[PDB]
Symmetry: D2
Subunit: 310 residues, 4 copies
């Protein structure tokens, strides 16, 4: 039957007899996503990551379901005024890949939603929860089409934006990543700076000792695109720690965690090398994390080589 994101969220929200605050929040995000999608298709005529930031910021503020908002674009967390204050914490990158938008390759919005756990007054620390605590997370990918991928406790669902009616149509129910993929994704230009484990794992994808087929390589350089491909076709994506960047480069709160959550809810894995990404407890909201995610056999096989190098 015909399913929309807005119908989907109402059915499950009625099922659980919750107050509606999350359903309101998600509609607020999803309405913001359509706006960003619309501006991104004419992005150039007559900044853009600032429109996207203010759009999400204000649609979230006025949903009455948020108390603390963390954005890549703001130095400190945003504390909602008391009259509009609600029960959830939101971390989001409003336009990831906006530095690589001239080449018109994919850009995206990534979000993670937490519950405020304490009853203290809202502060920056309410966003410093571990990824395990995520209530809902996912991304909008503004590509050949606009797709919203929503991961929650029940699982991962893919909605396609139909611009003719401005509704997110359910196109992939409860998606589950392949156990093992045939594709690897990372920037090999920085091979000069690779941790030796990364060097060895990549060589094994290009030169298998067991004389099976070598893997293919893809790297758009936009995290939303690279991860979505890992989700849909299977494989491995790596933005790992090198010796210059000992904690990786991507941000934990609003890039690594929501992708780690989506992966895990699809049956995949997501690590820093040392632990699961979702078990890292943040002390800084803009802190970084290495990330290797994808099919469990591939993330495990990478972990097998990571173990070898001390």
């Amino acid at each position: 039957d015909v399913n929309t994101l807005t119908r989907f969220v109402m059915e499950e929200g009625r099922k659980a007899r919750g107050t509606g605050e999350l359903t309101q929040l998600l509609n607020s995000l999803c309405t913001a996503v359509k706006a960003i999608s619309s501006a991104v298709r004419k992005a150039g005529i007559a900044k853009l990551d600032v429109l996207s930031n203010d759009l999400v910021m204000n649609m979230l503020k006025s949903s009455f379901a948020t108390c603390v908002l963390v954005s890549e674009e703001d130095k400190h967390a945003i504390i909602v005024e008391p009259e509009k204050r609600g029960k959830y914490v939101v971390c989001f990158d409003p336009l990831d890949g906006s530095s690589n938008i001239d080449c018109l390759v994919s850009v995206g919005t990534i979000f993670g939603i937490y519950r405020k756990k304490s009853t203290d007054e809202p502060s920056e620390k309410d966003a410093l929860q571990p990824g395990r605590n995520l209530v809902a997370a996912g991304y909008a990918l503004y590509g050949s089409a606009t797709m919203l991928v929503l991961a929650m406790d029940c699982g991962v669902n893919c909605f396609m934006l139909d611009p003719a009616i401005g509704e997110f149509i359910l196109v992939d129910k409860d998606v589950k990543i392949k156990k093992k993929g045939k594709i690897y994704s990372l920037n090999e230009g920085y091979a000069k700076d690779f941790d030796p484990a990364v060097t060895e794992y990549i060589q094994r994808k290009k030169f298998p000792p067991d004389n099976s087929a070598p893997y293919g390589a893809r790297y758009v350089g936009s995290m939303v695109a690279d991860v979505h491909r890992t989700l849909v076709y299977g494989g491995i994506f790596l933005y790992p720690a090198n010796k210059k960047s000992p904690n990786g480069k991507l941000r934990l709160l609003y890039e690594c965690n929501p992708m780690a959550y989506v992966m895990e809810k699809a049956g995949g894995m997501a690590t820093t090398g040392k632990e699961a990404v979702l078990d890292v407890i943040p002390t800084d909201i803009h802190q970084r994390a290495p990330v290797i995610l994808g099919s469990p056999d591939d993330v495990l096989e990478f972990l097998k080589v990571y173990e070898k190098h001390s």
Copy 2:
């Protein structure tokens, strides 16, 4: 001032006091792109590159400006019935990258336009001209926005589709690629099969001898996106012959030739390793060709290593 694609082609067409057949052909092409763009932003829905083929076929056949049409989706060249017959030959990929559209990564339309050179009755042979003979070429990239790249004798111009009004807006007049880039683009999964020249060139990009910065890596795997990025940012793109596809992989008539034409007309280069791409005289409509294209300094620096290897 405000310029549209339809206006631009007519102004250059009026300037040359030509018959109007090419202007009609280009509008029939550009109208086709707008339909394809619509289809791609609304994909999924429970095959699509066949829509794109038949759209382009019928838009061209009824332009009265075409006589022989070569498409990736058809085994033989298409010979237009005489009542609609015209003076131009069109080679085209109606949806390049349509096998990687589940990942919502770029899809695109590539086209090459020849005036029929022989005076026989039209046949497949009329499509076997070399790229040097191209009158017009370019691509539509269905990405975060739909962008049309039109290369002609005067130079390269980029038009962005405005979806509110369905017009291609001029956003880049007389584009010129960077003299040298910082990005190389290829599938390194075929590393086991690389010609030593590609192997050495790639080694120089990751580990420079001159103690400069290594290049970055990008590879979408959809040729329109990689070429468009190379044009917009500079760098070098390679799909060389590996040991599996010894005559290269990309098609000469509608991938290599139109992209080589755009490169060269923007001050760049495009080679097979042995020669320039556009100087190759084709014998088969779906024949393949190795290709290395992009910035002149980068294409040249690769060619230096090709010489070194006999």
Copy 3:
């Protein structure tokens, strides 16, 4: 603040802590509205009031909020299957004015929503309520822009569809009709059959006795266009009882009743001449009704003239 139909409808439902079934009904209705609009902007291109009925029919059936559906296009009431059964009855014209769409004049969707009366099997009898029992009613007007007019207990609100984002933006909060207008609206070609009371009232509008300005005449003949203009500019709309048609022409259940409800909730009036439209108790789901509605001073002035005529 920025308000959309979906955000507004969730807040009113949260405030009153209802089960959510009406909000789902309104959203399924709204999605049908957007779908109809898109088709109405491309009509003629190769009936349509059948697409709209099937569109509303299945959007409502699968809302899980309805049990009985009465349409202008189906002879009997439609009983929703028990798996999809809900507590509300909806009477609607899915595409009002579908006979005059060649002139690109307005078309519309009219709906009225009731609460199920029986606890038996839902049946046609559940649709035979008087207008007073209406939970919600209103119309979508597909004109120069698409407008949704939603009337509830709190009042009447007007929403404008933004097609770039496919969200209904609130543009008119708690609208109230002018006390007295300067425009009258009915078909004067049928003057031959007028009840003498109608003849006298209309003549008073062309030739005022008190030496005031004569009223203007407007008549689109599509009920959604005329009533909305009556709502927004004030005046009176008449499709009265003549002796040839003693029960009027428009259908009571899904044209007169929702329009009367919107009028009354907006500070206006709506009569059969003999009584209020919402006070008529229907005996047939397709029964007819005379209707005179609009600004209260004008309807009263008509009613005082109807009284004079025996």
Copy 4:
């Protein structure tokens, strides 16, 4: 085969071996229509009022076409003389958003245009816009209704195009339209019946109460000229905005409302009169002068003109 406005106009322009200045002008016009159509469908989500943008939209699209020298608009008191670098050979009279005082009620709005070729070799001036309607090269209207329709009348005839919003192309949906010989619908404001010229009261009375006791006509009046005329074209009948004694010259403007509708009507086999003459034969003395107009099906306008004769 499947035809768009842009394909159609190029084919006819190549058939006639012309220079292209007219085709470019029409494309600049079509681009103006699509933009206005998009803005009208969002006529609420708020910087300047809409008819002021529409005027500037059409003004600058025509100026920068290199095909115009004189432009007459409802919103500008004098003709606008195009600067020489962008100067071309055509004159455009247009209403960029007709019916815009009644856009709040979402009833139809429209864009009306008539295009004349500059006749003199003098410097372009306001006088160049004073040609009569017969001299029209091209005219028609955009109706922004439930869908956006482009109606284009030329010497060969009248064609109706549908704006398809997914691709921004005007799709030809009605080739060489022809109005009914006789209709069953009349159109004018009967609120002003107290002020009717005596022939009008008689002709309307004949339509509500026919003497031959045939069927009475139905009445329709939107109050937007584009919609009222367009319904007349498609269904047949008669539209009237005639002269009363209070308004001896009618109300509508000749150069950019009456003339282009008269051209569309006549090229579609219809009629269009002031009562005293055919609309396209009036020789204008002021670019903003008014003219009465009665248009539509050939049989209906004639039955009116016969009543007009009885009255001196």
